[PDB]
Ligand binder design. Structure first.
Ligand SMILES: [Cl-]
Ligand SMILES: [Cl-]
Ligand SMILES: [Cl-]
Length: 162
């Protein structure tokens, strides 16, 4: 199991613009297009991102390319962020994927707001970290995915995904 397979399980793959759980226009493997209500705005963003007139539809390859970009961008933002970097450095490999999962989903700023959870993980207090992470809108809105990520942090294994 690797980060790409983990996220493909959590986000799915769709080749036509769809609305995410929050109602925003997305495509491929959890690639957010725009927060805007406009489908046209979405289509414009999409074309800008692919480099061609897509008319709301992309290929598998195109979807994987966006995914390669987003995962890379998530990892590099972690490494650049003063709050995230030290947590990431302190973690084992599996747990590292779990942080990358959160960042891909909610962005760097979002994850960086989880002050106490961050501290608990840096301290390797797994159980405490799992409990704090659960007290969030994130957990309440997408409980199945959140539980899977939380279990990855708690155990340090890929059990939740197997
Ligand atoms: Cl927290
Ligand atoms: Cl709550
Ligand atoms: Cl969910």
């Amino acid at each position: 199991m690797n980060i790409f397979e983990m996220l493909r399980i959590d986000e799915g793959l769709r080749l036509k613009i769809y609305k995410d759980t929050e109602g925003y226009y997305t495509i491929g493997i959890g690639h957010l297009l725009t927060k805007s209500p406009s489908l046209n705005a979405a289509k414009s963003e999409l074309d800008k991102a692919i480099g061609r007139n897509c008319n709301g539809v992309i290929t598998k390859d195109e979807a994987e390319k966006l995914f390669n970009q987003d995962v890379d961008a998530a990892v590099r933002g972690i490494l650049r962020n003063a709050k995230l970097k030290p947590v990431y450095d302190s973690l084992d490999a599996v747990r590292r994927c779990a942080l990358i999962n959160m960042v891909f989903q909610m962005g760097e700023t979002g994850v960086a707001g989880f002050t106490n959870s961050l501290r608990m993980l840096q301290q390797k207090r797994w159980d405490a970290a799992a409990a704090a992470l659960a007290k969030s809108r994130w957990y309440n809105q997408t409980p199945n995915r959140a539980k899977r990520v939380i279990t990855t942090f708690r155990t340090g294994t890929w059990d939740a995904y197997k």
